[PDB]
Amino acid sequence: QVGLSYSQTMLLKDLMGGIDPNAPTWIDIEGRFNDPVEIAIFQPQNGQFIHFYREPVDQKQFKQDSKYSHGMDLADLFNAQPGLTSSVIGALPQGMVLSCQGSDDIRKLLDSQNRKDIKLIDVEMTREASREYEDKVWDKYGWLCKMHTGIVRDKKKKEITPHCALMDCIIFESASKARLPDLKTVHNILPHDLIFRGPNVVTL
Amino acid sequence: GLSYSQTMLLKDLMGGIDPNAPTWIDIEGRFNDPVEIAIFQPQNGQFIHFYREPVDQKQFKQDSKYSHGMDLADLFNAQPGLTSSVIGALPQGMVLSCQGSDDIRKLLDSQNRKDIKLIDVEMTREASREYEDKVWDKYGWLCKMHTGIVRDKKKKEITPHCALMDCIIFESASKARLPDLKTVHNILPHDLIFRGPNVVTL
Ligand SMILES: [Mg+2]
Ligand SMILES: [Mg+2]
Ligand SMILES: [Zn+2]
Ligand SMILES: [Zn+2]
């Protein structure tokens, strides 16, 4: 598993400049803290965000998460750029404040990467209020992620909408402001050929 | 590979290299599977020295018996990906001197560093290694990896080849004397040359 090369790291550092260290910022993940498969970091004031995927180590756990949460396909993640999660988290500005829904797992994730400097705000919303704009967000911004193709069921075995880290970020922002974001454009600072493996290269 | 923080460290340390100064480069192992890299600046004694675990152990054990005499067990703790990172971090358009340019050229080109120029010094086989014994005597303490016995075509034993020593040997031959240096220094720290404590990489 070849991680980010030197040049890729320098590119990532440059691209991170497009993030406002002081602006409010959402973070959300799918998968457990020690084995995440999707990460999203969203700045609602200018539509700037970071979004990427990761191949899971525990395939047995991933199958369950898929069936009951994100509905992702392991086949789609095999081309994910290895080591991107550690690099991105390593590249985050010092002392940055991130907002989230359920900060237990994300805190463990940041700490595992020695980023105890990054602060987490648990915007504790009720499950009936947080998912109010679920349909509307998927409606307008669903084109940004097509990885959730599997069927997801709840306790009642009723088929429900899959969970996307990026959509969740926009969903939680909508609930916190009681309206969809007033944004002309949104933009992933990471390019496709950094999120996914590029052409083969000799790594030594 | 190298973590984000390690890469930022390597970038800072590389600042200790003068991009416009004379600089030797030498490797042990093939261009596609090297096991020792050395980059040496004769004017101030600053150098870069590190190791790599070989993919082809069969070819390695052959190189060991007839060239560098290194032990595969010593290389397991070598920081993975360090070779590509260092080469990626080298200043643009830098001029490197060496004795065996064809292999080093293929190495640099495989890393997309066509910008780096190589100077294959005019140097006779006998003249090139006149200072071999003197260099090892003075600087041998800098590398202890070459613990194995090495022989030529015949069963006659010979001194093993170190990438770092070779840089100092070739420099000595080029100026007809050992380097006039108060100090030499590896810009790379031990905890970056070898694996440090285990961290969660995702
Ligand atoms: Mg989520
Ligand atoms: Mg040599
Ligand atoms: Zn998604
Ligand atoms: Zn050596």
From Swiss-Prot, chain A:
It comes from Lymphocytic choriomeningitis virus (strain Armstrong). It comes from the Viruses. Mg(2+) binds at D28, E30, D168. Mn(2+) binds at D28, E30, D168. It is found in: Virion; Host cytoplasm. The N-terminal region is important for the cap-binding activity while the C-terminal region contains the 3'-5' exoribonuclease activity. A CCHE zinc binding site is present in the C-terminal region and may thus contribute to the substrate binding and/or the specificity of the exonuclease activity. Homomultimerizes to form the nucleocapsid. Binds to viral genomic RNA. Interacts with glycoprotein G2. Interacts with protein Z; this interaction probably directs the encapsidated genome to budding sites. Interacts with protein L; this interaction does not interfere with Z-L interaction. Interacts with host IKBKE (via Protein kinase domain); the interaction inhibits IKBKE kinase activity. Zn(2+) binds at E38, C145, H148, C164. The record marks D105 as: Important for exonuclease activity. This is Nucleoprotein.
Curated annotation (Swiss-Prot), chain B:
Belongs to the arenaviridae nucleocapsid protein family. It comes from Lymphocytic choriomeningitis virus (strain Armstrong) (LCMV). Zn(2+) binds at E36, C143, H146, C162. The N-terminal region is important for the cap-binding activity while the C-terminal region contains the 3'-5' exoribonuclease activity. A CCHE zinc binding site is present in the C-terminal region and may thus contribute to the substrate binding and/or the specificity of the exonuclease activity. It is found in: Virion; Host cytoplasm. Mg(2+) binds at D26, E28, D166. The lineage of its organism: Viruses, Riboviria, Orthornavirae, Negarnaviricota, Polyploviricotina. Changing E28A: Decreases interaction with host IKBKE, defective to inhibit IKBKE kinase activity and IRF3 activation. The record marks D103 as: Important for exonuclease activity. Encapsidates the genome, protecting it from nucleases. The encapsidated genomic RNA is termed the nucleocapsid (NC). Serves as template for viral transcription and replication. The increased presence of protein N in host cell does not seem to trigger the switch from transcription to replication as observed in other negative strain RNA viruses. Mn(2+) binds at D26, E28, D166. This is Nucleoprotein. Homomultimerizes to form the nucleocapsid. Binds to viral genomic RNA. Interacts with glycoprotein G2. Interacts with protein Z; this interaction probably directs the encapsidated genome to budding sites. Interacts with protein L; this interaction does not interfere with Z-L interaction. Interacts with host IKBKE (via Protein kinase domain); the interaction inhibits IKBKE kinase activity.
